């Protein structure tokens, strides 16, 4: 048997076995390294 | 020989305040004169930002031996007595009783000592005479 | 998740309260009830100090 | 039609002594009968109101029957609710009676302006008595905010050499943490369209809802009565804030936070308050051990008590969270016993000593005894009583708290009887400093205490004995109220 | 004189009439000091039986003794928020 | 009024810096180490013995069902 | 004649308390004393009545506690037990309030010192005399508050009042455990009287027995300062000599061994228990013993005297032989009240007013009378046979080789020891001081003199009672088959029988023999052959001396090592945490953080048409990224911040 705490969390939208499409990582930080790059040294 | 008391500090750096190594005046002279005799200070002297454990309402200090001496001595007394303890249990030295422990009718007077029917009995009986 | 999307969906207490209709399945985060099952209750506080047993 | 008298007098009350001095400001220099004696015969009107506003709670109590379950005297004024029940009654009537007294404490030590500071104090008795006996959430925060006003000017403008800091201490630590209960009474509002006591006592929230209202609740809570870690406010209020200011604020304000627990917290989030009992006992018996250590190295006279009435406001937390008759019912009246034991200190330390010798640095005093004997004795009988006496009422109430701890959870709540050694340890330690050895050489002699000086300390040692002694005067009223805090099922 | 006990069930009520829902908890708070007074009573007996008999006490008072310690621990005040919250069928 | 408390100087240093130690306070690793035992180490060690004894202690009335007593006597001969 | 036995010491004691500048202070000290004789009186009566003809008393005053099932009410019943109590404590205390009347006849303030001494009286009195646990506890606080007065009297006296600030606090810490031991008392059994709870004993669980039982013992430590709490019984003496004759005979010190008496009922089923309290006796009376034999105070030595004796006492109650320490308690209660008041009667006829016993010699020719109380009170300390001691002290260490236990066995050296121990410290004390040649300036002795008729009559009166009482009163104690049921005897630790049969003959002449015989070969030692006893020659002589006069160190472990430390930590709660962390996470902690982001904002507000427009420019970028990447732009401007 567990312990019995507190649950303090505001509701989510849980998304269940076989959802939640995984996102690559690697290209949506590529994307945010470029895209500021570029304006932070543009300007 | 005169060591201060525990949990004294060697370096404080609180800004301005004057630096000066920790006295504790319950080890001053009585016989000298004091301003505040009764706490043996002289008016206007600086205190310590820790002096609340030297004056004289702080616990008495004990400076007669080193701190570690007295463990060494008082854990010492006590080593004889685990030792003089310890060894008669070893082989049983202590006298044996000359006798039966104390006996009683009525099953050891079961039903004396709350004992309600006939399975508890054991849980209530004293030792029980078995020459009834 | 909001309170207001939650209450257009039935999730709130827009009708009010009946203590007759007793809901197993858990109630939702914004809805409240006039009485629970002790079983549920029994899986959060737990037994022990004073529920069920003392 | 207690509020209505209540609320209506003072506010005739608050006009007069508005009118008559004011009237004289004018063009003209300030030669006027009223201002002769130290504005006499303004502060004399403010010290009857207060004693008379303690005469209304009386013609409403010989109506009050201490069997019937539920609100009494269910009155609707200004569009809410007001009701009193047993423990309503008697933490109203233990504040009315400290009116009177934190008047009587600053007759003759202020420096000016009494007509102002005399209305200041009573506007604070009333907003407090009022907060006893509301019927809803919102209602309940109101009168809990509204004292802050007063409070933060009184300390100002009244202050010592540190008021500035303490002024603000008091004023952001009590709105930056009940504005956090401001949200949890607002999700009450909205998920149940009314903050009501007896609509939301019946309802039962989702288990993550009522946590982040428990939250959202404890957390003004644990800040209006000083525990650890957002205790560091009071002592820096204590230091700074006047006779007044201090026998209000450690006397009743610091109660309401035990009595939040009983309206915002008991019944309506029952269930997530068992979730939450072994943590507040861990939060609480560690504040009661600190706030004690703690007190051992201070050094300043009025921080000292300061830090001694959170240790016994530890010990009411600890019972009201027990989940039985034995523990509320005590905690309750360490209450009442804790609202005279302590304004008494502050008359003894920040009201005599100060007032005379005008320094708070224990170093200076030791030996009063010597030249002072009266002083003593009421220094040492107050002390014995803030200690645990059996005599006393901080006994009862510290037996029954620390037993209705054991009974809830038998193992850390053993650790609530460390509140009767470490009491001991810091209060005597200061009674055992200020009336030991040789007089002290700093201090010249002086006169002893006073007729007023006897008079406040006579009346706030009476009912801390009566109820020690005799504590059914108390527990027969709230019997019946406080057991319906109770939450089990036995099956 | 003496108002007795407006014995309600919870079970037998609808918790919207707020004037019954108040009888279901007053009747279930009232029918919970009788317990711990029939309790005292009890109690009141284990005492004067135990002094009268004398080194007798452990037969004397075994049944008195044994029922007090049966009945202790259900007969004290519960409260009714734990059954009116509360329904043990489910 | 006539000055009735002889105002010692080295006391007036001695409450200022007692009550402005907060000021010169630095968050060194002697700090963090007596900050760790006093706030994580005591109230999470209390945190263990409030749970996991918490709803296990029925002790009110709790008969024995255990005897006490030893009822054969063997002597060491 | 029930309330008149009790109250009527705190109605004398207020008399003098606020009446006292009003009727002067030789009227006010005979008023006290009046006060008291009326209560000894009272208690022979009931004695008559209690203990002769089994009647017991009651009086309910008016309830205290009526939450739910507990009930408390003020109320004093009066049974065998507690008129055993009363005996000591009534009888002796109106001795010293008659020896007090000369004694602090010289003092500035008697008007209060025989104000707090009746108080104290009073304050004993309800703790034997409450019929339900609480009501002791009532009792129980008010000897520490009693004795906080009485140790701290001359409160000008530096050492003094620290010193009852030692006597308050260390007993609170018994009273920290008491209170602990009666809240389990509520939760197992629901109430404290002591007819409901001794009837269940044989039906409560042993675990929750004995958490109760540990507590009563931990309390009992503080109170008859047995070992681990035992350094306020030596500083007491800080106090005027009455007060250590009442404290150290029938009061304070006797009040932890009363509590554990008062619950045998449930100290029985719990064998656990009975073993740490035999073995703390054992080892009080060893170390007490050690330590008096090298004291040098006259105080000292008999403040000794008491901790040795009182820890017989607890090895009697680890056999479960709860009635041969009553009966020891009541005979220990007059050759050791005797004792303080020949002493305190030593001080006083010397004129220099010394107490170090080596500034003394010869003076058994200068006060003989002093010197024959101290002699008759010594045999009877010793356990001489036919003196009160001998009826008492003996058969309790008789029985510790009775039980034919290990525990038992180990146990019975430790008090043979100090059975010939206290033979050895009581010789060296009278030779020292009446058997020596002369220390102090021959000027004091052509002035060395006894005293009045006051100071003497209570000396004769215990004197008497120092030689027959113990034989008078055996048989309704230690009597076969007496019925004693207020105290439980289980029927299994019963070995009163193997005790008094099974012993050899050299056990019941041991203790004497080593007494008689350890005693003259010291004082020959002491009398011709003087050149052994300098200790400063052998280191390892020199050592263990120096180690058994500073008390086994543990004053200086108490002082330096626990109360130096405990108070260190208060003091890192004071820098690092209420000072500290709180401070960095508060006021002065949110001032830095605010004025760094207030300086950066104040730089933003200046008159400038090309700054107000690139950041309207800027805000255009919001509209045209892709709402997934507001977080970094938070992020990003909270680093700009920096
Ligand atoms: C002169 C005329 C006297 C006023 C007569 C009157 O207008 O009656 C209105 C009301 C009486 O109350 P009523 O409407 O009969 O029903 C109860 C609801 N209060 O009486 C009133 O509404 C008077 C209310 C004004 C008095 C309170 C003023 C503000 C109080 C602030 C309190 C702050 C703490 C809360
Ligand atoms: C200034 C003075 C202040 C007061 C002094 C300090 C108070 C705290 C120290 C004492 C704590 C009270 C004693 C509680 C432990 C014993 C209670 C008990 O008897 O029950 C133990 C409980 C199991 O119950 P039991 O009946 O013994 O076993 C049946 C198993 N079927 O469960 C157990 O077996 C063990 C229970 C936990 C053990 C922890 C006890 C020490 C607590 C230390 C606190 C942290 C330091
Ligand atoms: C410091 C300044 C001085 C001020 C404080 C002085 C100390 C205060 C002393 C008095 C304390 C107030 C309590 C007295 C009021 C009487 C209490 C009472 O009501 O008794 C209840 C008792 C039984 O209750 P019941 O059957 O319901 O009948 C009452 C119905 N009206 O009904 C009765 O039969 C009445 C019984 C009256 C008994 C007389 C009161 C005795 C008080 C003194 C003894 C206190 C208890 C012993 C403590 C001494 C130390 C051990
Ligand atoms: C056990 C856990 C440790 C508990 C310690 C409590 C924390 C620290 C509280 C002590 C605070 C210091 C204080 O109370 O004031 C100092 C006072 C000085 O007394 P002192 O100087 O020795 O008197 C000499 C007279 N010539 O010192 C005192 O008088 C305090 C008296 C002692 C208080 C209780 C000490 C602990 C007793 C249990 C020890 C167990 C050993 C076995
Ligand atoms: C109270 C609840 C338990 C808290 C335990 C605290 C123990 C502790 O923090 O010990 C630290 C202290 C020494 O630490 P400190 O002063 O920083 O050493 C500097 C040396 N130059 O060491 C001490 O002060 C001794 C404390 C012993 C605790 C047992
Ligand atoms: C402190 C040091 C004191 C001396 C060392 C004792 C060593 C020893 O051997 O002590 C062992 C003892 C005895 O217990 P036992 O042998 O089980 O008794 C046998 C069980 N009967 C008696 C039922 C037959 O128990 C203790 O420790 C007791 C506590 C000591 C004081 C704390
Ligand atoms: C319980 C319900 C009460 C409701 C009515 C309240 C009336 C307020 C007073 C108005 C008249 C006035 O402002 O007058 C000013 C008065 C009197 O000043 P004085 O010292 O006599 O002036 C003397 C001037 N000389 C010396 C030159 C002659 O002082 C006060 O400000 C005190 C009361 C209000 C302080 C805090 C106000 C903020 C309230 C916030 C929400 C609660
Ligand atoms: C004055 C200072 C105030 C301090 C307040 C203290 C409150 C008490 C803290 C109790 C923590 C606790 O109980 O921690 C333990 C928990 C539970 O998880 P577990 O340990 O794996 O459970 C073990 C379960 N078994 C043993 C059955 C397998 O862990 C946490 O998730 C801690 C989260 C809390 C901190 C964020
Ligand atoms: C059984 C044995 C009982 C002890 C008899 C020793 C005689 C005594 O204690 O006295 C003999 C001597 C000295 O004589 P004194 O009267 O103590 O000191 C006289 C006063 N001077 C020194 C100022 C002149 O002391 C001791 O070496 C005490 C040793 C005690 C510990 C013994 C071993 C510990 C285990
Ligand atoms: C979640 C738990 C909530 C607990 C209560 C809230 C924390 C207490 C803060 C009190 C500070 C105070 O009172 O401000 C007083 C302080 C400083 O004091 P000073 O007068 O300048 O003295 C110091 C004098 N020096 C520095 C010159 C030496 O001013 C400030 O820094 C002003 C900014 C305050 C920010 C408040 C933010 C609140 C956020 C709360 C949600 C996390």
């Known amino acids: 048997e567990q312990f019995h705490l507190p649950q303090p969390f505001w509701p989510t939208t849980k998304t269940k076995e076989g959802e939640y499409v995984p996102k690559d990582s690697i290209r949506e930080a590529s994307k945010v390294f470029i895209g500021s790059g570029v304006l932070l040294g543009g300007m | 020989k005169s060591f201060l008391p525990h949990f004294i500090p060697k370096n404080y750096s609180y800004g301005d305040y004057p630096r000066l190594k920790p006295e504790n005046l319950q080890k001053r002279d009585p016989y000298l004169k004091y301003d505040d005799q009764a706490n043996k200070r002289n008016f206007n002297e600086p205190l310590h930002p820790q002096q609340d454990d030297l004056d004289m309402w702080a616990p008495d200090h004990f400076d007669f031996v080193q701190d570690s001496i007295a463990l060494k001595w008082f854990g010492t007394f006590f080593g004889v007595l685990a030792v003089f303890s310890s060894v008669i249990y070893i082989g049983g030295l202590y006298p044996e009783k000359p006798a039966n422990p104390r006996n009683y009718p009525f099953s050891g007077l079961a039903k004396d000592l709350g004992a309600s029917s006939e399975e508890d009995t054991l849980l209530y009986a004293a030792k029980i005479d078995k020459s009834i | 998740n909001s309170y207001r999307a939650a209450l257009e969906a039935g999730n709130g207490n827009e009708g009010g309260f009946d203590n007759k209709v007793i809901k197993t399945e858990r109630q939702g985060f914004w809805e409240g009830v006039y009485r629970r099952p002790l079983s549920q209750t029994v899986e959060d506080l737990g037994e022990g100090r004073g529920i069920i047993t003392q | 039609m207690l509020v209505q008298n209540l609320i209506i007098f003072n506010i005739i009350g608050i006009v007069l002594l508005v009118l008559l001095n004011n009237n004289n400001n004018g063009i003209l220099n300030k030669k006027s009968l009223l201002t002769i004696k130290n504005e006499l015969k303004l502060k004399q009107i403010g010290l009857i109101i207060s004693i008379i506003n303690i005469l209304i709670i009386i013609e409403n109590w010989i109506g009050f029957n201490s069997n019937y379950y539920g609100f009494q005297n269910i009155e609707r004024f200004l569009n809410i609710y007001w009701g009193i029940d047993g423990i309503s009654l008697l933490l109203v009537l233990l504040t009315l009676i400290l009116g009177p007294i934190a008047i009587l404490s600053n007759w003759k030590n202020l420096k000016g302006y009494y007509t102002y500071y005399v209305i200041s104090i009573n506007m604070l008795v009333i907003l407090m008595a009022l907060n006893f006996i509301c019927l809803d959430l919102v209602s309940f925060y109101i009168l809990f905010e509204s004292t802050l006003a007063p409070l933060f000017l009184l300390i100002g403008i009244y202050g010592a050499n540190n008021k500035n800091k303490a002024a603000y201490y008091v004023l952001i630590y009590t709105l930056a943490s009940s504005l956090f209960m401001l949200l949890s009474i607002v999700i009450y509002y909205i998920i149940i369209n009314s903050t009501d006591y007896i609509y939301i006592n019946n309802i039962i929230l989702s288990i993550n809802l009522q946590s982040l209202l428990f939250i959202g609740i404890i957390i003004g809570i644990a800040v209006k009565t000083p525990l650890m870690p957002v205790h560091t406010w009071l002592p820096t209020v204590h230091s700074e804030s006047p006779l007044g200011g201090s026998i209000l604020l450690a006397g009743v304000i610091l109660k309401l936070a035990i009595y939040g627990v009983i309206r915002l917290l008991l019944p309506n989030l029952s269930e997530i308050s068992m979730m939450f009992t072994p943590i507040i006992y861990i939060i609480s018996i560690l504040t009661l051990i600190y706030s004690s250590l703690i007190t051992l190295k201070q050094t300043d006279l009025k921080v ?170 108390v527990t027969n009223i709230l019997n019946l109220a406080s057991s319906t805090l109770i939450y089990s099922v036995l099956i | 004189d003496h108002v007795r006990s407006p014995n309600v069930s919870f079970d037998d009520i609808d918790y919207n009439n707020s004037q019954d829902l108040h009888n279901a908890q007053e009747s279930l708070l009232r029918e919970q000091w009788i317990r711990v007074s029939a309790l005292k009573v009890c109690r009141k007996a284990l005492e004067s039986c135990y002094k009268t008999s004398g080194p007798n006490h452990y037969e004397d008072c075994r049944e008195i003794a044994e029922k007090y310690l049966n009945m202790l621990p259900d007969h004290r005040i519960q409260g009714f928020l734990g059954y009116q919250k509360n329904d043990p069928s489910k | 009024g006539p000055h009735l408390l002889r105002e010692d100087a080295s006391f007036q240093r001695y409450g200022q810096l007692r009550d402005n130690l907060a000021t010169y306070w630095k968050f060194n690793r002697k700090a963090a180490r007596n900050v760790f035992i006093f706030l994580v180490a005591v109230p999470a060690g209390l945190g263990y013995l409030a749970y996991n004894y918490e709803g296990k202690t029925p002790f009110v009335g709790k008969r024995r069902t255990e005897p006490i007593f030893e009822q054969d006597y063997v002597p060491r001969k | 004649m029930i309330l008149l036995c009790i109250f009527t010491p705190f109605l004398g004691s207020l008399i003098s308390g606020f009446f006292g500048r009003y009727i002067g202070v030789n009227s006010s000290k005979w008023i006290v004393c009046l006060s008291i004789f009326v209560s000894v009186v009272s208690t022979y009566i009931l004695f008559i009545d209690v203990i002769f003809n089994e009647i017991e008393y009651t009086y309910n005053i008016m309830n205290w506690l009526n939450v739910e099932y507990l009930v408390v009410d003020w109320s004093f019943t009066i049974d065998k037990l507690s008129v055993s109590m009363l005996v000591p404590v009534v009888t002796v205390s109106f001795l010293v309030h008659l020896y007090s009347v000369s004694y602090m006849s010289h003092d500035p303030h008697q008007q209060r010192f025989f104000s707090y001494l009746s108080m104290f009286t009073f304050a004993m009195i309800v703790l034997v005399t409450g019929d339900n646990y609480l009501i002791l506890f009532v009792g129980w606080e008010f000897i520490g508050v009693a004795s906080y007065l009485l140790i701290s009297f001359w409160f000008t006296r530096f050492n003094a009042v620290k010193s009852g600030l030692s006597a308050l606090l260390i007993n609170r810490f018994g009273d920290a455990l008491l209170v602990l031991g009666l809240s389990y008392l509520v939760l197992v059994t629901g109430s404290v009287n002591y007819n409901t709870v001794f009837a ?433 732009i938070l992020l990003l401007i909270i680093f700009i911040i920096l």
């Open chain 4, 304 to 473: 000292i008590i300061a830090y001694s009435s959170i240790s016994h406001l530890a010990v009411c937390m600890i019972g009201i969270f027990a989940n039985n008759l034995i523990g509320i019912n005590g905690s309750l009246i360490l209450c009442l016993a804790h609202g005279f034991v302590s304004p008494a200190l502050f008359i003894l330390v920040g009201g005599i000593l100060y007032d005379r010798y005008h320094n708070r640095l224990i170093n200076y005093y030791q030996g009063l005894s010597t030249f002072m004997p009266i002083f003593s004795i009421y220094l040492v009988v107050f002390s014995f009583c803030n200690t645990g006496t059996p005599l006393s009422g901080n006994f009862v109430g510290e037996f029954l708290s620390i037993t209705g701890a054991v009974i809830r959870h038998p193992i850390i709540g053993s650790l609530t009887a460390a509140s009767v050694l470490l009491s001991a340890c810091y209060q005597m330690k200061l009674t055992n400093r200020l009336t030991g050895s040789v007089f002290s050489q700093y201090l010249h002699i002086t006169n002893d205490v006073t007729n007023r000086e006897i008079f406040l300390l006579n009346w706030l040692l009476i009912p801390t004995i009566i109820i020690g002694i005799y504590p059914s005067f």
């Open chain 7, 200 to 632: 269940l004993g044989s039906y409560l669980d042993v675990n929750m027995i004995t958490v109760i039982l540990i507590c009563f013992l931990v309390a009992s430590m503080a109170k008859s300062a047995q070992l681990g709490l035992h350094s306020w019984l030596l500083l007491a003496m800080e106090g005027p000599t009455p007060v250590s004759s009442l404290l150290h005979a029938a009061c304070l010190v006797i009040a932890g061994v009363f509590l554990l008496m008062r619950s045998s009922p449930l100290l029985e089923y719990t064998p656990i228990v009975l073993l740490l309290i035999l073995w703390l006796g054992g080892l009080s009376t060893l170390i007490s013993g050690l330590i008096a034999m090298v004291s040098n105070d006259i105080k000292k030595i008999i403040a000794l005297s008491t901790m040795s004796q009182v820890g017989i006492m607890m090895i009697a109650i680890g056999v479960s032989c709860y009635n041969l320490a009553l009966f020891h308690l009541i005979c220990h209660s007059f050759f050791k009240a005797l004792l303080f008041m020949s002493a305190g009667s030593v001080i006083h006829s010397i004129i220099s007013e010394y107490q170090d016993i080596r500034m003394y010699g010869g003076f058994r020719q200068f006060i003989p009378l002093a010197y024959t109380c101290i002699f008759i009170a010594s045999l009877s300390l010793m356990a001489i046979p036919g003196l009160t001691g001998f009826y008492s002290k003996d058969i309790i260490i008789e029985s510790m080789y009775g039980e034919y236990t290990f525990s038992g066995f180990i146990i019975y050296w430790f008090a043979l020891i100090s059975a010939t121990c206290t033979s050895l410290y009581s010789i060296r004390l009278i030779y020292y001081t009446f058997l020596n040649n002369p220390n102090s300036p021959k000027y004091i002795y052509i002035n060395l003199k006894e005293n009045d008729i006051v100071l003497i009559t209570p000396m004769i009166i215990l004197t008497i009672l120092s030689i027959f009482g113990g034989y008078l009163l055996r048989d309704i104690y230690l009597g076969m088959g007496s019925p004693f049921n207020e105290l439980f005897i289980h029927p299994n630790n019963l070995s009163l029988i193997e005790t008094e049969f099974s012993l050899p003959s050299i056990l019941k002449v041991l203790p004497l023999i080593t007494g008689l015989g350890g005693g003259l070969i010291l004082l020959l030692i002491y009398e011709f052959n003087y050149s052994l006893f300098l200790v400063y020659n052998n280191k390892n002589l020199s050592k263990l001396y120096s180690f058994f006069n500073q008390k086994i160190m543990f004053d200086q472990l108490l002082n330096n090592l626990i109360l130096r430390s405990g108070l260190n930590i208060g003091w890192l709660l004071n820098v690092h945490i209420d000072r500290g962390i709180l401070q960095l996470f508060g006021p002065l902690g949110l001032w830095k953080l605010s004025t760094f982001i207030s300086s950066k904002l104040n730089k933003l507000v200046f008159l400038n048409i090309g700054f107000i427009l690139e950041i309207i420019v800027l805000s255009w970028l919001l509209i045209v990224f892709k709402v997934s990447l507001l977080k970094y």
